[PDB]
Amino acid sequence: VKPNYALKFTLAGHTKAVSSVKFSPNGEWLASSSADKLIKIWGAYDGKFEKTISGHKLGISDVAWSSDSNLLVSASDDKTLKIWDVSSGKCLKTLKGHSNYVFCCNFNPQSNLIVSGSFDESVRIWDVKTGKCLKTLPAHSDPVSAVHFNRDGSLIVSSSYDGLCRIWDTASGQCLKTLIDDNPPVSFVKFSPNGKYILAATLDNTLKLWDYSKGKCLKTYTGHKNEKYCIFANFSVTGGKWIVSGSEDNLVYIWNLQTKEIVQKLQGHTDVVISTACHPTENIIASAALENDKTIKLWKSDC
């Protein structure tokens, strides 16, 4: 009925606010990015520090894994993304074209494409092999807070401070849907793993589950604090079905997906929990916090 997530490891190393944490698809590794301009790789199960990857000229707001767990892409205030070979630590490509901070990024499931969102208000689609920008979408009228591919890579969902979520055809770049509620800034969005929903965060302390085909809100989740930061949210589906999110009161919130009831509040961080990630095969949550904390935490549950 309720999970029992408990703190197992605290990962210290970044010297500035952590921005994003992500588990590799194969479940072996955790990648973290930070305002200290570094990417760090840790063991997903024991939190053991593995290596530091560097190269960006300014700090990093997001990092994301390719489907084979070999490549990373990062989004930086230096207006570029970088594609990394994790095993070598090498920067393979630097993706140039955005005219302002790059804020969010993701590979498609095939991992031949990368999608990025920027303060320049555009979404760009990049070729992984060549590093070339294939399409620039005039996606929003304000910073783009999140971008994500669906299960088969045919769709992209984007969110922005303009208050909109938009669904894009990957192949043509056509906007297929604009989601409009009864218009607070949208600070995060992603497709559900089964592909039938998107989960959207807005800066009015609200998470919303949408049927993006019907353009209808199914569930809402509240009780947490989120008015200032683009905090990652997740579907947890390895055990029970939960929604997981960070919060500006320093807690990790966990909701029952169906009933919308808060089932757990994880205490430990000493600053805003900017990022949470759910492990692909096991009941494990990674969380990370901002400047006054700078640590990453691994929590484990029996369901």
């Binding site: 930070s34 305002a35 930061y229």
Partner: peptide, 14 residues
């Protein structure tokens, strides 16, 4: 001065 990232700064709405 180079250790800056947009996600780690709050939104400025006023």
């Amino acid at each position: 001065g180079t250790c800056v990232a947009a996600r780690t700064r709050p939104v400025l709405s006023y």
